[PDB]
DNA sequence: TGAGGTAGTAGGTTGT
DNA sequence: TACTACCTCG
DNA sequence: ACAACC
């Protein structure tokens, strides 16, 4: 195709030695379990037995494969699972050769490779080993804490029969003191804490003045002798009474608690510039390679293609959405905005007034600025003021306020939403020279009033693009969809989300949401779209889009479905020259990496991994549209999002519905991006 | 609540 | 998934 | 348990 340069890149992967003739013929084992596992427990049981055997062994089909000879294995024993007891016996059955060309057998080989890496790393010193991560050096150290530097690794087997090493530098934050000693250093309370005696964590709420030897526990025991009776005080001291929270406040001891340290609990930048991350990636790869007898690492190369530069349009061409404030909007209607001040002051700050007037003047659209002379503490009278403002044509409200606590922020926003009013919060004190902050607030306000601040100018295969995501922080989730309608993406819409149990969006929900976007397109363009681009956040669960694809096909609407994965893309580095944006790296059929955003100061970019799950549009064209769609987001004035706009929008939508609840959205217009 | 991504920290679902 | 620190403003 | 995502 017509690319803007064919270049070569390094992946953080490394080619290593071919598997030797022993490794290609692992020892096979038949598994006998007594009692036989239930349907639910069979695979975890086989895996558990594989772990229990020792050496380097994994599950292979209904049986086992090992790179250790059975004479150093534990072939018989006893398992506990979910409160049961299984006797296991392993019967050696010789060795069967595995073909790397065959993806199943290659999968078994790769499981073995990973196990190999685990085991050989565990036998090392002196390095901190955690799973597939290795922390070698000490990056930083403070009173009672330290940050280790190392790398997260993976090891698998290519179809040519060789080892492949993945490496990505990582840091790990360690506390080495008890909650007692920790607070005994002047350090303030950690938000989260772990038991000293096992892995369970709690949310630390406050300290108590109570006596542990006198605090009754449900059941008769006191705190102190409860923990004593379990042998937890055998080797340490009780300390004070910490009140932690249930996953209902719960008593605990400061002597039996270890803070879990985050960045909030601690000048330490843990993001690396891409040159340094590349360099360390190599260092650690060669190190691993030499320590494990896996050969000299060969960095793998891939053909990359530079995508065309996106042309962002306001009233005229812009390089960033914030420019639409000086130049004018892509499409500006007659608008009314209202002001709500919670800081006891009066009227619109003059520079905000001037900026808004300037933008709308450049757009040639009229602007009315209202003021809410009411306050949330008035109760229902406040709601009546909101209603009246809505009746007078106010589309969204700017809230000037001191920083609000999360719950108050949520309550106020939800309340305004119930009167059909999206809100943009802007914190005071606010100086005129804090330009990025209040210009971004204004862009938020405007998208929330339903204006199109920018659009795309290019030509794309799909004239409707819709993103699907699931969100919410509870036992249930909201599945939702957002969309850009028209080839220019000159209309951004959300749809009413749906509650669901998990990550999978029900097939009927997927289709009903999609149909809503089709209908939005119909309302805008007076016709059905020729082709639609379906974007799924993360993986597509099996058959999730089946009904939707069937429905689209019945209507004669073409489609492409792309899984968009925010991790698993690894790292990409330039072979020569500077690292740039808009990088398309085709890996295998229907799969490719896309480097959508990057700034040097911002650390090392994490390229997206994309899978073309259905449709016949060429990979380059999809890469082109998704990359350009990344530039459509209106509410970020100075930095484009990594995700294409429909997904970024969908993510924010289901996040906000998760926070506020869906019950507030009935009177909010779907063109008003209330969640940005 | 200014925004973004990269970083860290905790956890979860899908599915073999 | 979702939180916060950091750094800077296509 | 484990993998590959969230
Ligand atoms: C046994 C028991 C413990 N607890 C609290 C005290 C311990 O600090 C906390 C955690 O105990 P655990 O780690 O054994 O689960 O549970 C109660 O609140 N009620 C009880 O009946
Ligand atoms: Mn998601
Ligand atoms: Mn999301
Ligand atoms: Mn916002």
């Amino acid at each position: 195709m017509n690319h803007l340069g064919k270049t070569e890149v390094f992946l953080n992967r490394f080619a290593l030695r071919p598997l030797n003739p022993e490794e290609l013929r692992p020892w096979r084992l038949e598994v006998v379990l007594d009692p036989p596992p239930g349907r639910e427990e069979v695979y975890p049981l086989l895996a558990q037995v594989a772990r229990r055997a020792g050496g380097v062994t994994v599950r292979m089909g209904d049986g086992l494969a090992s790179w250790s000879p059975p004479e150093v294995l534990v072939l018989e024993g006893t398992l506990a699972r979910m409160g049961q007891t299984y006797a296991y016996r392993l019967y050696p059955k010789g060795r069967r050769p595995l073909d790397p060309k065959d993806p199943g057998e290659r999968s078994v080989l790769s499981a073995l490779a990973r196990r190999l890496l685990q085991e050989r790393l565990r036998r090392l010193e002196g390095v901190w080993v955690e799973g597939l991560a290795v922390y070698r050096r000490e990056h930083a150290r403070g009173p009672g804490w330290r940050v280790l530097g190392g790398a997260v690794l993976d090891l698998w087997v290519s179809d040519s029969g060789a080892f492949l090493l993945e490496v990505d530098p990582a840091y790990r934050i360690l506390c080495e003191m008890s909650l007692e000693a920790w607070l005994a250093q002047g350090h303030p309370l950690p938000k989260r804490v772990r038991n000293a005696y096992d892995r369970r964590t709690w949310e630390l709420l406050r300290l108590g003045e109570e006596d542990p030897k006198e605090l009754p526990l449900p059941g008769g025991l006191s705190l102190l002798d409860y923990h004593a009776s379990k042998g937890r005080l055998q080797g340490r001291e009780g300390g004070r009474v910490a009140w932690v929270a249930d996953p209902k406040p719960i008593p605990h001891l400061t002597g039996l608690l270890v803070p879990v340290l985050t960045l909030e609990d601690l000048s330490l930048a843990l993001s690396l510039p891409w040159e340094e991350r590349r360099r360390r990636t190599r260092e650690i790869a060669s190190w691993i390679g030499r320590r494990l007898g896996l050969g000299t690492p060969e960095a793998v190369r891939a053909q990359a293609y530079r995508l065309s530069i996106p042309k962002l349009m306001g009233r005229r061409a812009v390089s960033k959405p914030a420019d639409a404030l000086r130049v004018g909007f892509y499409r500006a209607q007659e608008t009314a905005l209202a002001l709500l001040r919670l800081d006891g002051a009066q009227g619109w700050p003059e520079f905000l007034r001037r900026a808004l007037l300037r933008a709308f003047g450049a757009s040639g659209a009229s602007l009315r600025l209202h003021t809410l002379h009411a306050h949330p503490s008035q109760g229902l009278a406040f709601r009546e003021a909101l209603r009246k403002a809505k009746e007078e044509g106010v589309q969204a409200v700017l809230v000037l306020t001191p920083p609000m606590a999360w719950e108050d922020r949520n309550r106020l926003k939800a309340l305004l939403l119930r009167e059909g009013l999206p809100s943009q919060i802007l914190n005071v004190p606010l100086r005129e020279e804090e330009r990025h902050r209040w210009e971004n607030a204004l862009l938020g306000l405007l998208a929330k009033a339903g204006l199109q601040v920018v659009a795309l100018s290019g030509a794309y295969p799909a004239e409707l693009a819709v993103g699907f995501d699931a969100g919410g922080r509870e036992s249930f989730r909201f599945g939702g969809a957002a969309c850009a309608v028209g080839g220019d993406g000159g209309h951004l819409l959300w749809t009413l989300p749906e509650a669901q149990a998990g990550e999978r969006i029900p097939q009927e929900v997927v289709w009903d949401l999609l149909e809503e976007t089709l209908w939005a397109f119909r309302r805008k363009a007076g016709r059905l779209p020729s082709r639609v681009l379906l974007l799924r956040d993360g993986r597509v669960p099996q058959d999730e889009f089946a009904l939707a694809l069937e429905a689209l096909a019945r209507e004669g609407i073409a489609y492409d479905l792309v899984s968009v994965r925010k991790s698993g893309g690894g790292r990409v580095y330039p072979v020569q020259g500077r690292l740039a944006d808009g990088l398309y790296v085709p890996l295998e059929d229907k799969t490719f990496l896309l480097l959508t955003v990057h700034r040097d100061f911002r650390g090392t970019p994490r390229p997206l991994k994309l899978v073309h799950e259905a449709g016949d549009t060429p990979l380059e064209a999809l890469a082109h549209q998704i990359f350009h769609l990344t530039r459509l987001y209106p509410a970020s004035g100075f930095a484009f999002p990594r995700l294409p706009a429909p997904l970024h929008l969908a993510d924010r939508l289901v996040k906000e519905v998760g926070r506020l609840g869906i019950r507030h959205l009935k009177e909010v217009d779907r063109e008003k991006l209330f969640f940005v």
Side-chain angles (χ1 to χ4, degrees), chain A residues 1-39 42-81 83 85-106 108-126 128-135 137-212 214-228 230-236 238-247 249-266 269-310 312-472 474-577 579-587 589-676:
Chain A
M1 36 77 186
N2 305 320
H3 59 73
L4 271 64
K6 182 197 284 265
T7 171
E8 275 213 324
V9 299
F10 294 120
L11 310 180
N12 59 333
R13 300 157 177 201
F14 295 89
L16 288 168
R17 72 165 171 86
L19 275 65
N20 65 50
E22 298 295 280
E23 286 151 349
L24 290 169
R25 308 169 60 260
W27 281 274
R28 183 186 53 253
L29 304 98
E30 171 193 359
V31 184
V32 173
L33 296 167
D34 183 19
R39 173 173 187 84
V42 45
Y43 291 140
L45 225 34
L46 243 50
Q48 191 178 351
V49 184
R51 265 281 175 175
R52 276 246 185 185
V56 180
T57 113
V58 299
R59 175 179 71 87
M60 175 175 60
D62 300 327
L64 244 54
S66 186
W67 277 346
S68 289
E71 293 80 17
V72 301
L73 297 185
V74 188
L75 306 186
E76 302 170 26
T78 55
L79 301 159
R81 166 180 175 78
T85 297
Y86 300 84
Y88 82 82
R89 182 161 182 175
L90 306 179
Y91 292 83
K93 284 296 172 52
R95 312 171 69 176
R96 199 185 174 186
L98 266 36
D99 199 335
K101 293 297 179 179
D102 184 274
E105 295 180 349
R106 161 155 43 93
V108 182
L109 292 175
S110 294
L112 284 165
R114 185 171 308 181
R115 201 69 184 93
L116 182 301
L117 176 66
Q118 298 186 25
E119 291 309 289
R120 292 205 191 178
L121 285 177
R122 292 191 69 173
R123 309 197 191 246
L124 290 192
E125 50 206 3
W128 196 284
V129 173
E130 181 174 28
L132 290 174
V134 168
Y135 304 93
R137 65 178 178 276
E138 181 175 292
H139 179 69
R141 162 150 201 93
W145 58 269
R146 63 187 179 122
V147 177
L148 300 189
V152 170
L153 315 179
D154 192 14
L155 218 230
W156 68 92
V157 179
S158 74
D159 52 319
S160 55
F163 284 111
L164 277 171
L165 210 213
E166 185 168 345
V167 176
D168 198 22
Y171 296 100
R172 180 79 211 244
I173 308 180
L174 301 177
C175 194
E176 51 202 8
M177 292 186 338
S178 67
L179 219 218
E180 254 307 302
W182 185 253
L183 296 186
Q185 287 298 318
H187 297 302
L189 276 58
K191 265 174 170 175
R192 184 187 271 101
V193 75
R194 177 183 269 103
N195 292 330
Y197 43 86
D198 69 351
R199 240 73 213 110
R200 290 151 61 228
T201 57
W202 311 92
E203 171 174 299
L204 182 56
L205 302 168
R206 63 175 177 85
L207 289 196
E209 313 298 326
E210 15 271 7
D211 192 322
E214 287 290 335
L215 212 181
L217 256 29
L221 292 178
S222 78
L223 231 192
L224 194 59
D225 38 13
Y226 164 72
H227 278 295
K230 283 186 142 286
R232 297 165 176 175
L233 291 177
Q234 205 290 87
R236 27 198 188 269
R240 298 179 291 266
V241 175
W243 287 98
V244 308
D246 200 320
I250 294 175
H252 214 310
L253 300 183
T254 57
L256 292 174
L257 286 176
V258 176
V260 298
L261 302 184
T262 63
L263 292 174
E264 187 182 9
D265 301 320
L266 307 180
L270 299 179
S271 67
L272 295 171
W274 66 265
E275 296 95 335
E276 189 177 336
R277 182 173 293 275
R278 205 221 310 197
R279 200 243 305 152
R280 293 184 189 278
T281 306
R282 289 205 161 105
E283 295 173 345
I284 296 184
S286 69
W287 177 79
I288 280 297
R290 154 186 53 258
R291 283 306 207 101
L292 271 45
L294 295 180
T296 296
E298 172 175 342
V300 352
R301 293 163 163 260
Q303 215 64 215
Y305 300 83
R306 308 194 172 280
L307 300 180
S308 65
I309 306 159
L312 251 207
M313 280 298 291
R315 134 86 49 160
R316 43 186 190 83
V318 295
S319 63
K320 59 187 188 286
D323 291 337
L325 289 168
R326 318 88 161 81
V327 131
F329 310 120
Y330 183 75
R331 188 183 57 258
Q333 40 200 11
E334 175 164 6
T335 86
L337 275 12
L339 189 63
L340 175 56
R341 281 224 191 226
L342 306 178
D343 63 344
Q346 337 288 114
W348 290 79
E350 188 60 29
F351 60 92
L352 290 183
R353 186 175 209 98
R354 293 193 278 104
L356 284 175
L357 251 14
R358 174 182 299 116
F360 275 74
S363 302
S366 71
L367 172 65
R368 214 193 306 123
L369 298 184
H370 299 249
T371 292
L372 278 158
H373 299 300
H375 190 281
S377 287
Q378 291 177 286
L380 291 171
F382 182 68
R383 225 246 232 212
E384 175 69 8
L386 294 176
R387 190 194 63 78
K388 279 180 190 177
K390 223 290 176 58
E391 207 182 52
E392 282 166 20
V394 167
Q395 293 155 333
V397 10
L398 182 59
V399 186
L400 292 184
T401 170
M404 312 180 71
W406 265 105
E407 313 84 44
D408 299 331
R409 179 260 181 200
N410 289 344
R411 182 176 295 106
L412 181 66
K413 284 190 160 280
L415 173 66
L416 299 220
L417 247 19
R418 291 200 294 280
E419 276 302 321
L421 293 170
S423 62
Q424 174 67 51
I425 297 179
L426 183 53
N427 284 335
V428 285
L430 173 67
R431 297 135 64 217
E432 184 171 359
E433 60 264 19
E434 293 174 278
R435 214 191 66 168
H436 306 95
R437 184 153 71 92
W438 61 255
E439 283 194 357
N440 261 357
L442 257 28
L443 289 170
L445 216 215
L446 292 171
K448 286 167 177 174
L451 282 73
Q452 274 295 103
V453 357
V454 288
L456 290 167
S457 185
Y460 307 101
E463 48 179 354
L464 174 62
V466 18
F468 300 78
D469 199 13
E474 288 185 281
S475 348
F476 62 91
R477 281 185 174 185
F478 289 96
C483 71
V485 353
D488 53 345
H491 282 96
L492 303 173
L493 287 296
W494 60 273
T495 59
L496 237 212
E498 183 63 70
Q500 57 187 50
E503 166 61 20
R504 166 179 294 266
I505 311 167
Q507 306 196 23
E508 334 88 62
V509 177
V510 181
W511 167 245
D512 291 352
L513 297 178
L514 178 52
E515 191 203 273
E516 282 301 318
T517 70
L518 294 178
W519 213 242
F521 186 96
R522 197 261 91 147
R523 295 192 309 263
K524 262 53 181 59
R527 63 189 175 88
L528 292 183
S530 156
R531 183 174 224 109
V532 302
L533 175 58
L534 279 15
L535 308 174
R536 175 75 221 251
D537 187 78
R539 291 160 58 185
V540 176
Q542 184 64 37
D543 289 324
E544 181 178 72
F545 277 76
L547 250 150
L549 269 27
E550 281 187 351
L552 285 178
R554 287 178 189 113
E555 296 290 334
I557 299 174
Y559 57 82
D560 292 274
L561 201 228
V562 178
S563 168
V564 180
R565 304 171 191 184
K566 300 174 300 305
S567 66
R571 254 44 134 99
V572 166
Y573 302 109
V575 158
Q576 114 88 25
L579 183 53
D581 257 347
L583 230 42
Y584 159 63
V585 189
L587 288 190
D589 209 14
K590 302 302 191 196
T591 314
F592 62 99
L593 303 186
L594 193 62
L595 213 197
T596 58
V597 291
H598 167 68
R599 321 271 63 190
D600 287 317
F601 70 84
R602 206 210 272 151
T604 304
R606 303 175 308 205
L608 299 167
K609 180 182 174 177
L610 292 83
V611 179
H612 192 192
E613 222 84 27
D616 57 24
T617 291
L619 240 52
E620 328 90 52
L622 295 177
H624 183 248
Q625 178 151 17
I626 296 173
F627 173 52
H628 280 204
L629 275 168
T630 225
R631 239 113 287 210
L632 223 214
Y633 193 64
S636 183
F638 309 90
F640 304 117
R642 184 162 68 121
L643 293 174
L647 273 180
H648 194 73
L649 290 166
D651 171 70
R652 294 299 198 268
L653 168 65
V654 297
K655 214 176 298 288
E656 269 294 88
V657 173
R659 273 134 81 184
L660 307 189
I662 200 166
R663 71 195 171 278
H664 316 284
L665 303 192
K666 187 151 168 51
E667 253 54 78
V668 189
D669 293 330
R670 285 184 290 226
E671 255 119 311
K672 297 179 179 187
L673 308 186
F674 71 89
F675 45 82
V676 298

mmCIF file of all heavy atoms in Angstrom, chain A residues 331-337 360 364-368 392-395 449-451:
data_model
loop_
_atom_site.group_PDB
_atom_site.id
_atom_site.type_symbol
_atom_site.label_atom_id
_atom_site.label_comp_id
_atom_site.label_asym_id
_atom_site.label_seq_id
_atom_site.Cartn_x
_atom_site.Cartn_y
_atom_site.Cartn_z
ATOM 1 N N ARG A 331 -18.285 21.929 14.249
ATOM 2 C CA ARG A 331 -19.694 22.253 14.075
ATOM 3 C C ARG A 331 -20.192 22.830 15.381
ATOM 4 O O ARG A 331 -20.106 22.186 16.429
ATOM 5 C CB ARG A 331 -20.516 21.031 13.657
ATOM 6 C CG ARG A 331 -21.965 21.356 13.263
ATOM 7 C CD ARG A 331 -22.763 20.096 12.916
ATOM 8 N NE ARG A 331 -22.752 19.150 14.026
ATOM 9 C CZ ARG A 331 -21.983 18.067 14.066
ATOM 10 N NH1 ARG A 331 -21.174 17.790 13.048
ATOM 11 N NH2 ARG A 331 -22.017 17.264 15.122
ATOM 12 N N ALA A 332 -20.671 24.064 15.320
ATOM 13 C CA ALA A 332 -21.123 24.748 16.520
ATOM 14 C C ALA A 332 -22.567 25.172 16.377
ATOM 15 O O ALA A 332 -22.936 25.866 15.435
ATOM 16 C CB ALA A 332 -20.242 25.954 16.810
ATOM 17 N N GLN A 333 -23.379 24.737 17.325
ATOM 18 C CA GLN A 333 -24.780 25.115 17.383
ATOM 19 C C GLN A 333 -24.936 26.316 18.302
ATOM 20 O O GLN A 333 -23.976 26.745 18.936
ATOM 21 C CB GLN A 333 -25.614 23.930 17.877
ATOM 22 C CG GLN A 333 -24.931 23.145 19.007
ATOM 23 C CD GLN A 333 -25.483 21.739 19.176
ATOM 24 O OE1 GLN A 333 -26.242 21.248 18.340
ATOM 25 N NE2 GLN A 333 -25.098 21.084 20.264
ATOM 26 N N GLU A 334 -26.136 26.879 18.347
ATOM 27 C CA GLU A 334 -26.479 27.869 19.360
ATOM 28 C C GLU A 334 -26.446 27.199 20.723
ATOM 29 O O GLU A 334 -27.129 26.196 20.935
ATOM 30 C CB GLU A 334 -27.860 28.459 19.081
ATOM 31 C CG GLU A 334 -28.373 29.416 20.137
ATOM 32 C CD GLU A 334 -29.529 30.255 19.627
ATOM 33 O OE1 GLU A 334 -29.995 29.993 18.497
ATOM 34 O OE2 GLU A 334 -29.968 31.172 20.354
ATOM 35 N N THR A 335 -25.623 27.706 21.635
ATOM 36 C CA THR A 335 -25.489 27.051 22.930
ATOM 37 C C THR A 335 -25.670 27.985 24.121
ATOM 38 O O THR A 335 -25.427 29.194 24.047
ATOM 39 C CB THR A 335 -24.122 26.351 23.089
ATOM 40 O OG1 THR A 335 -23.147 27.275 23.577
ATOM 41 C CG2 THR A 335 -23.675 25.775 21.786
ATOM 42 N N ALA A 336 -26.097 27.379 25.223
ATOM 43 C CA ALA A 336 -26.260 28.043 26.499
ATOM 44 C C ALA A 336 -25.545 27.222 27.569
ATOM 45 O O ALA A 336 -25.732 25.997 27.656
ATOM 46 C CB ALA A 336 -27.729 28.217 26.832
ATOM 47 N N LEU A 337 -24.677 27.886 28.329
ATOM 48 C CA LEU A 337 -23.921 27.248 29.410
ATOM 49 C C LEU A 337 -24.281 27.907 30.732
ATOM 50 O O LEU A 337 -24.492 29.107 30.760
ATOM 51 C CB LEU A 337 -22.420 27.387 29.168
ATOM 52 C CG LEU A 337 -21.604 26.425 28.301
ATOM 53 C CD1 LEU A 337 -22.472 25.485 27.483
ATOM 54 C CD2 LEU A 337 -20.651 27.212 27.418
ATOM 55 N N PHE A 360 -16.698 30.918 20.226
ATOM 56 C CA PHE A 360 -17.982 30.929 19.537
ATOM 57 C C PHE A 360 -18.055 31.983 18.446
ATOM 58 O O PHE A 360 -18.763 31.802 17.455
ATOM 59 C CB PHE A 360 -19.106 31.122 20.540
ATOM 60 C CG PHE A 360 -19.541 29.847 21.170
ATOM 61 C CD1 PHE A 360 -18.750 29.232 22.130
ATOM 62 C CD2 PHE A 360 -20.721 29.240 20.783
ATOM 63 C CE1 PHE A 360 -19.145 28.038 22.701
ATOM 64 C CE2 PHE A 360 -21.116 28.046 21.348
ATOM 65 C CZ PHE A 360 -20.329 27.445 22.311
ATOM 66 N N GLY A 364 -18.764 31.469 14.632
ATOM 67 C CA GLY A 364 -19.940 32.149 14.118
ATOM 68 C C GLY A 364 -21.234 31.589 14.689
ATOM 69 O O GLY A 364 -22.247 31.513 13.992
ATOM 70 N N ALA A 365 -21.202 31.196 15.960
ATOM 71 C CA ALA A 365 -22.390 30.686 16.632
ATOM 72 C C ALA A 365 -22.655 31.517 17.883
ATOM 73 O O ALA A 365 -21.721 32.008 18.514
ATOM 74 C CB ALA A 365 -22.216 29.214 16.987
ATOM 75 N N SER A 366 -23.919 31.667 18.259
ATOM 76 C CA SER A 366 -24.220 32.520 19.394
ATOM 77 C C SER A 366 -24.128 31.740 20.707
ATOM 78 O O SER A 366 -24.425 30.547 20.774
ATOM 79 C CB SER A 366 -25.602 33.168 19.244
ATOM 80 O OG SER A 366 -26.638 32.222 19.400
ATOM 81 N N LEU A 367 -23.711 32.449 21.747
ATOM 82 C CA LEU A 367 -23.464 31.874 23.052
ATOM 83 C C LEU A 367 -24.211 32.639 24.140
ATOM 84 O O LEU A 367 -24.155 33.869 24.192
ATOM 85 C CB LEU A 367 -21.959 31.887 23.343
ATOM 86 C CG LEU A 367 -21.554 31.481 24.759
ATOM 87 C CD1 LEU A 367 -21.930 30.040 24.972
ATOM 88 C CD2 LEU A 367 -20.062 31.659 24.954
ATOM 89 N N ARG A 368 -24.924 31.917 24.998
ATOM 90 C CA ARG A 368 -25.549 32.541 26.167
ATOM 91 C C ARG A 368 -24.954 31.956 27.442
ATOM 92 O O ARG A 368 -24.845 30.727 27.584
ATOM 93 C CB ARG A 368 -27.067 32.372 26.150
ATOM 94 C CG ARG A 368 -27.817 33.557 26.749
ATOM 95 C CD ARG A 368 -29.281 33.222 27.017
ATOM 96 N NE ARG A 368 -29.945 32.718 25.819
ATOM 97 C CZ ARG A 368 -30.552 31.537 25.735
ATOM 98 N NH1 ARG A 368 -30.580 30.722 26.781
ATOM 99 N NH2 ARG A 368 -31.128 31.165 24.598
ATOM 100 N N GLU A 392 -34.788 26.965 30.243
ATOM 101 C CA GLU A 392 -34.327 28.166 29.564
ATOM 102 C C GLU A 392 -33.240 27.857 28.533
ATOM 103 O O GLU A 392 -32.697 28.767 27.915
ATOM 104 C CB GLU A 392 -33.831 29.198 30.579
ATOM 105 C CG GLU A 392 -34.969 29.947 31.264
ATOM 106 C CD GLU A 392 -34.528 30.707 32.493
ATOM 107 O OE1 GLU A 392 -33.312 30.979 32.623
ATOM 108 O OE2 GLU A 392 -35.401 31.046 33.323
ATOM 109 N N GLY A 393 -32.909 26.577 28.366
ATOM 110 C CA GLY A 393 -32.060 26.155 27.265
ATOM 111 C C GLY A 393 -30.613 25.868 27.602
ATOM 112 O O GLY A 393 -29.812 25.584 26.709
ATOM 113 N N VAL A 394 -30.284 25.918 28.888
ATOM 114 C CA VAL A 394 -28.948 25.589 29.360
ATOM 115 C C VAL A 394 -28.641 24.136 29.004
ATOM 116 O O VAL A 394 -29.474 23.256 29.213
ATOM 117 C CB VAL A 394 -28.836 25.822 30.892
ATOM 118 C CG1 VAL A 394 -27.571 25.203 31.474
ATOM 119 C CG2 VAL A 394 -28.933 27.321 31.219
ATOM 120 N N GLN A 395 -27.463 23.885 28.438
ATOM 121 C CA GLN A 395 -27.139 22.535 27.988
ATOM 122 C C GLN A 395 -26.170 21.818 28.919
ATOM 123 O O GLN A 395 -26.217 20.593 29.033
ATOM 124 C CB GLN A 395 -26.572 22.578 26.574
ATOM 125 C CG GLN A 395 -27.591 23.008 25.524
ATOM 126 C CD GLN A 395 -26.929 23.616 24.312
ATOM 127 O OE1 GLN A 395 -25.842 24.173 24.415
ATOM 128 N NE2 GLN A 395 -27.580 23.520 23.159
ATOM 129 N N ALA A 449 -21.844 19.720 26.318
ATOM 130 C CA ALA A 449 -23.022 20.450 25.855
ATOM 131 C C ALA A 449 -23.432 19.919 24.495
ATOM 132 O O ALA A 449 -24.460 20.317 23.958
ATOM 133 C CB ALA A 449 -22.750 21.945 25.795
ATOM 134 N N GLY A 450 -22.600 19.038 23.934
ATOM 135 C CA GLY A 450 -22.959 18.336 22.717
ATOM 136 C C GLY A 450 -22.420 18.947 21.438
ATOM 137 O O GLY A 450 -22.911 18.632 20.360
ATOM 138 N N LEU A 451 -21.404 19.802 21.555
ATOM 139 C CA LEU A 451 -20.731 20.358 20.385
ATOM 140 C C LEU A 451 -19.660 19.419 19.843
ATOM 141 O O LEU A 451 -19.030 18.684 20.604
ATOM 142 C CB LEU A 451 -20.082 21.703 20.712
ATOM 143 C CG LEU A 451 -20.999 22.916 20.787
ATOM 144 C CD1 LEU A 451 -21.840 22.858 22.051
ATOM 145 C CD2 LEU A 451 -20.188 24.190 20.718
#
